[model samples]
Target chain A: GMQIFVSTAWFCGKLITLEVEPSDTIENVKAKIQDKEGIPPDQQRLIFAGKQLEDGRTLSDYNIQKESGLQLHRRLRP
Target chain B: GMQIFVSTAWFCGKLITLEVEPSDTIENVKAKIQDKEGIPPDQQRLIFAGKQLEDGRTLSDYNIQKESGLQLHRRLR
Candidate 1:
């Protein structure tokens, strides 16, 4: 069960870290973002390397790696 | 004085038509989205052709053309 970290600096204007596994769902990262940003899963929009993270997709699905800083955007209405 | 349109389908699940100019800043598009999507300029992240549109940069800076479909991803938190 090896884990890794990602740089979530854009989430809060600060460096926020997340420990993840290849098997972890993209939603998992969203959850961590919720913890730090107080935003719920439905409102989270995680984009990696210019692609939108889809539900039911794993972190590795998009080739997300350690130290990868994903862009986290919040929807306007809910 | 050529005006073009962008398809903002991802913004609200509906087809949003925005008439823009080459000299218009990307921020200008955000303002139109705010009008229709109610998302403020600071909150809008307009991505076109897989690149995030930045404020203060005109549409021409990115070579944005007519009928381009942009991804409207909202930042969480």
Candidate 2:
């Protein structure tokens, strides 16, 4: 299993790094983030390269890499 | 030409109201925002309703209304 490092940043200024695989679904990544940051997975809005990632899609589906940063916004409930 | 009120918010806590027409393209709105916030239009990524607004599309094309709120993310380019 190939592993890559990802830096995740929250809107509130918290940042952390985790190892992820290209085949890992965003849902999986969110779970790990939720565990670390305490942000509910359901309430997390993860974005990459100005686009939001679908929980069902894999990291590589969005071309995520060590060169990339993931931005997490708390989903605004309407 | 009808005007609708749009409230724009950035990741950094700046918010502004823009008077825009349905005919106004996202690029035009971005121009106004650039004038106000100094964030370059090309470096702006605007999102409405979990979806990113395209520069070429008009506000009405996205069903934008007085109830809609636009979130602007400074493009990380």
Candidate 3:
């Protein structure tokens, strides 16, 4: 089990802590974020360590560890 | 600027501190390791958070941060 912190530009300075498995893919993480923050997966752009996380890759694929902080940017539609 | 600790199975309790940028690729890091430890990049397998790092990806691609610890395994032919 790994714990990661997610912060959104919408809510400055607040972080949401989520428990996830290293095997969980980035899409699955977005789903979890959707459940907690009411933001749909398509609308969420997750960033970690200055790089945008790809959908099909697992946390371990990115070497994401416990206490890692991720950023969520809301994707807006024109 | 980020600092990471690297340990090798051969050196049980020793850790080597490395300074790297998130943009540095795994291959670059291995090269640095070679410079410091006299080990060739081709023989070093770097691991972090249970995942083996691929040569072409950057540290940020793996979300490696300051104080992160990496394991270096000697890849024997």
Candidate 4:
């Protein structure tokens, strides 16, 4: 398992630490965020290395390493 | 990334070398095996340290290190 830091402007620039595996899907990581931050998975958008992470993809797909920093944004509902 | 060896009885005790990341899932590894050996992912079973590897889990979960040896079996339909 690797530790990653997620920062979000929505939460007043809050920084959250999450324990995650590189094989874990983006969807699963969102679910974990929801569990800890009360944000629904559908409403969350995650970005790593300036690229948005797709739900079906894993952190390893983006080459995310230990202690990597990610940006979390709120997906606007139409 | 690390190198791992997979041995299978179905291939006449063939030994395969694979380059993989510790965070790679069992399912992805199966897909890689399929790419090299033409074995379908669904028909592949991987074992490490005498335990079956789950599709949803990563190699790191099993504590698989570099140069680890794995066993591959064919699933009966």
Candidate 5:
């Protein structure tokens, strides 16, 4: 989630939301991705904070527990 | 929305926002996928600043009304 997560945070420089529940896990959370971008199971990505879930972590393990926030991406330039 | 919504804010220690019109429905908003995640319509999921939308509620019934803004997730790993 670090990709967009980083710049998103810095862009707004404020507290924004991602739009999902925190209880969802890596495998189970793919649905939300599809909601916005229609991301398939094999096409979901991690772009928040300074770390990515790495596709094998639990919701609790990754510290996701809300349903209306955004993952901050630090890098805004390519 | 709820899926990437969580870890998204955590990994970056910050916030992020989604694209498309917030006025869209829990179903209608499904089109934005193709722009970013490249997701198809038949595979949209429900997530975000909702109180159990349950795929049975309408966009107006939910609480999504905007253009370009993120919801808000609080927590960390």
Candidate 6:
């Protein structure tokens, strides 16, 4: 019932980081990002370890394992 | 006690702006920025020069009394 409550300039959610476990598959990581960050699967273009990731490539294929640094941002405007 | 922060995007800090004394009337400033900021009574949402503002009412009504800088942002997701 209020306009101010809907302003993007007002409220935002919190953020957390997830480590890439060696056993974690690529699709698994993608799903995790999608679930945790509200990132749509099709829209989940992630930059991992300085290289952009293809949706189907596993983290080990890129030589990344045991936790990679993930900087997540809301895809939508705020 | 909840899911890790419930997971959010980058966190941001609150921003604050102060105002000048006597220069309190924001209507005077709104009239000045009317040409530049495109701020209308209905769409003009901002805190200025110390006092909070409202639609329809002029800044002078609040006696803003200062050259208050404004910090703005978006929270779209």
Task: Give the TM-score of each candidate.
Answer: 0.41, 0.42, 0.41, 0.42, 0.31, 0.35
In terms of docking quality, model 6 is incorrect
lDDT (Cα) of model 3: 0.57
Q: Which ten residues in a row have the lowest lDDT in candidate 3 chain B?
A: B2-11
Instruction: Looking only at chain A, give the TM-score of model 6 against the true structure.
Output: 0.52
| Worst window of 10 by summed lDDT in candidate 4 chain A | A3-12
lDDT of 5 by residue, B1-77 (tens): 35233333333333334644334555565445457545455534434544433443565565444443443222221
Each model's total of backbone clashes? 6, 0, 1, 0, 48, 16
DockQ of candidate 1 is 0.02
Error of 2 at A6 (Å): 29
Pairs clashing within candidate 3: A62-B62
Q: Model 3 over residues B1-77: C-alpha lDDT tens digits?
A: 11111111221223566665555676676776556556667766666666777677875678854566665555754
Cα deviation in Å at residue B61, candidate 5? 47
**Candidate 1, residue A33: CA error in Å?**
1.5
Q: How much of the true contact map at the interface does candidate 2 reproduce, as a fraction?
A: 0.00
**Residue B64 of model 5, lDDT score:** 46
Per-residue accuracy of model 2 over A1-76 as CA lDDT, tens digit each? 2211111111114345666676667777677666655666776767666675677765557666553456666677
Docking class of 1: incorrect
RMSD from true fold, candidate 3:
18.2
Candidate 6 per-residue C-alpha lDDT over B1-77 given as tens digits, one digit per residue, 9 for 90 to 100: 11111123232223333233343343453343345433343333455445555434654565432343443332222
Error of 2 at B71 (Å): 16
* C-alpha root-mean-square deviation, each candidate: 15.0, 15.6, 18.2, 19.8, 14.8, 11.8
Please provide, for model 4 over A1-78, each residue's C-alpha lDDT reduced to its tens digit, 9 standing for 90 to 100. Answer: 332121111212345567777767777667766665667777676666666668886566777676666666656763
Give lDDT tens digits, candidate 1, residues A17-72. Answer: 66666567766667766665566778666666667668797656666555566655
Give the Cα lDDT of each candidate: 0.54, 0.55, 0.57, 0.57, 0.43, 0.42
Model 2 chain B scores worst on lDDT over the 10 consecutive residues at B1-10
Candidate 2 yields a Cα-based lDDT of 0.55
What TM-score quantifies how close candidate 1 is to the native fold? Answer: 0.41
Q: Model 4, retained fraction of real contacts?
A: 0.00
Candidate 4 residue-wise lDDT, B1-77, digit = tens: 21111111221234556675566776676776557666667866665556676677765577765565665555654
Model 3 chain A, poorest ten-residue lDDT window? A3-12
